[PDB]
Design an enzyme around this catalytic site. Sequence first.
Site, PDB file in Angstrom:
ATOM      1  CB  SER A   1       2.445   2.541   6.472  1.00 25.44           C
ATOM      2  OG  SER A   1       1.434   3.127   7.248  1.00 25.44           O
ATOM      3  CG  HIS A  58      -0.443   0.455   2.462  1.00 24.71           C
ATOM      4  ND1 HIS A  58       0.003  -0.463   3.393  1.00 24.71           N
ATOM      5  CD2 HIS A  58      -0.162   1.681   2.967  1.00 24.71           C
ATOM      6  CE1 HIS A  58       0.537   0.185   4.417  1.00 24.71           C
ATOM      7  NE2 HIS A  58       0.452   1.484   4.186  1.00 24.71           N
ATOM      8  CG  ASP A  70      -0.096  -3.908   2.769  1.00 27.89           C
ATOM      9  OD1 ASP A  70       0.376  -3.514   1.701  1.00 27.89           O
ATOM     10  OD2 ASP A  70      -0.313  -3.181   3.739  1.00 27.89           O
TER      11      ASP A  70
END
Lengths: 254, 35
Positions: A202, A43, A99
């Site tokens: 992230s 992502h 992911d």
Amino acid sequence: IVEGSDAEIGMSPWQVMLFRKSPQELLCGASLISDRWVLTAAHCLLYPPWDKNFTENDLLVRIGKHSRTRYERNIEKISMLEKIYIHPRYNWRENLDRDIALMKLKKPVAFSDYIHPVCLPDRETAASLLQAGYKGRVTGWGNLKETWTGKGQPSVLQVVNLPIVERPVCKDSTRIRITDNMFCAGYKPDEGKRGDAAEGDSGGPFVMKSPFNNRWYQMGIVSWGEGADRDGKYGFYTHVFRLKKWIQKVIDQF
Amino acid sequence: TFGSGEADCGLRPLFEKKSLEDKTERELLESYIDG
């Protein structure tokens, strides 16, 4: 990182900063797994709902850093990307399953006291350490606050240790369909202690130190959450061991 | 392909390689041993 503390110098030498060339800004975290490969979350590079689709020339990776903003001359290493590989089954439409993404550097980097690769788990390390209550460590330059509007930015790399959470409690905490390729971590409301990854962290690593050989292993990648530091909610991580065969297929393919 | 690094992965130059412990790693290890 919410409720963490300043990292010590050389504490997370596999930490990588994914940096957007133009405009200049921190995009996400990542990790060094060899002298030529960096691991991150899909992502961070591809997310169609936000019309996000970075190409190799849009980014650079910065390895060996401590300060969030200073150009750490003679300490950090800035590398360009040869190619990006997104997991073909990355599910951005529903739940961010799989992911995970790999980035091949244009040329290998030399290791130093500040730049060194993390290990990928073998099946015995995964069997022994992925247990509820066991703590892993997350590092990054993301926001310091859960609260609001600045969300706070750190002067230097932040670190927090967080416990893995029982799968039924993870599933119960969100309406998103959780898969076996994800796990969650964080303190429960009644544990009193706080701490979480936040925006900007992230793609970074969730690592555990093996009691068997005292090496650090990357067991997760910071993937998604619903309000960082929000007790009752937990952070979700890509299960690296479960996706290790895909990582090896990519690396022994290019 | 992979390149160098696998062999010595996960051992930090400023910590494990110098027999020094960082400030909070003991919290991690005790969590695996105690409960």
